[PDB]
């Protein structure tokens, strides 16, 4: 909600292609395989 | 350089085939991950 009026320092644009069912696997607590080898996602992932 | 016991093919392929269902379609993803260091990004509104 506050994205429209919030200040950000710098961005990293990271682009890739995954499977359709792997999109819902991107969630804190959900299981998956991307988080370890293709893209590192911390549980405090500051991004969108 | 040979296949067999304890020696498998190093690479695996994503299962994208025509018979795949709706949930197995390729989704392209772009992620803007924000880091702090010089803050040239603000909000339009």
């Amino acid at each position: 909600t506050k994205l429209n009026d919030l200040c950000f320092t710098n961005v990293y644009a990271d682009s890739f292609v995954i499977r359709g069912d792997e999109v819902r696997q991107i969630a804190p607590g959900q299981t998956g395989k991307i988080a370890d080898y293709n893209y590192k996602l911390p549980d405090d992932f500051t991004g969108c | 350089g040979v296949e067999g016991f304890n020696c498998y093919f190093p690479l695996q392929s994503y299962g994208f085939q025509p018979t795949n269902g709706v949930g197995y379609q390729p989704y392209r993803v772009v992620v803007l991950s924000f880091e702090l260091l010089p803050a040239t990004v603000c909000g339009p509104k």
């Epitope: 370890d36 | 299962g15 994208f16 085939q17 269902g21």
Partner: antibody, heavy 118, light 106 residues
Framework: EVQLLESGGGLVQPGGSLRLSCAAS????????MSWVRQAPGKGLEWVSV???????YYADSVKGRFTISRHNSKNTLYLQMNSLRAEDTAVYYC????????????WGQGTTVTVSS | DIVMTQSPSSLSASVGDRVTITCQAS??????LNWYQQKPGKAPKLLIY???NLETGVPSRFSGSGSGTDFTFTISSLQPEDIATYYC?????????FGQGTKVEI
């Protein structure tokens, strides 16, 4: 050279602590996939837990908080201490060197059963 | 989640009859189903992986096929060694739940 031997198992009571362990040689548990799996009597196989490369722990639904996993490269061993057990847990357990998706559980050992009878 | 509702669980036939195993899945499995030979009381032994390739050691009397919803396992030459429980497993959608398997006994 390479070998995955099993240790532990018995007749622990429900809610009673026990220690299952898989000792590996020829691989590295910390930086490679390895897994533990159960097989219930009269039922098919059931996935339990995995250890990945990079300090990422993933468990099944029923063993999310009941098992405790810890790995060591000194002897290439994986330990799971199980406390607060349930009676249904009686089943034959295996430690496996799962290698992603190229045919699941291609290599088998012996496997040890755990009876949680009173 | 992908769950398979395999109708047959324990079928009995005479010696020499064909063995046809069909394993239906809720969602589409993309060339990613396995067929094992587990034997009475013994540990499962994997025969067919990735739904199309044969492993060195598997007898020629076993065949597996399928790419999608439908998956088939065929045994033409019935033997007493084939009295076992054949399982269908989907290593496709996390979590990778195992199958129940149909038990053939002659």
């Amino acid at each position: 050279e390479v070998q995955l031997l099993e240790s532990g198992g018995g007749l622990v009571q429900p809610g009673g602590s026990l220690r299952l362990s898989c000792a590996a040689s020829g691989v590295t548990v910390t930086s490679n996939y390895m897994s533990w799996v159960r097989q219930a009597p009269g039922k098919g196989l059931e996935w339990v837990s995995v250890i990945y490369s990079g300090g990422s722990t993933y468990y099944a639904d029923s063993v999310k908080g009941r098992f405790t996993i810890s790995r060591h490269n000194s002897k290439n061993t994986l330990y799971l201490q199980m406390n607060s057990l349930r009676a249904e847990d009686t089943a034959v357990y295996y430690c496996a060197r799962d290698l992603r998706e190229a045919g699941g559980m291609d290599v088998w050992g012996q496997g040890t059963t755990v009876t949680v009878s009173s | 989640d992908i769950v398979m509702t395999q109708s047959p669980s324990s079928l009995s036939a005479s010696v020499g009859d064909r063995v046809t195993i069909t394993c239906q899945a809720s969602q589409d499995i993309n060339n990613y189903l396995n067929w094992y030979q587990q034997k009475p009381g013994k540990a499962p032994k994997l025969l067919i992986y990735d739904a199309s390739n044969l492993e060195t050691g598997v007898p020629s009397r076993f065949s597996g096929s399928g790419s999608g919803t439908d998956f088939t396992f065929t045994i033409s030459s019935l033997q007493p060694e084939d009295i076992a429980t054949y399982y269908c497993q989907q290593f496709d959608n996390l979590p990778w739940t195992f199958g129940q398997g149909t038990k053939v006994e002659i």
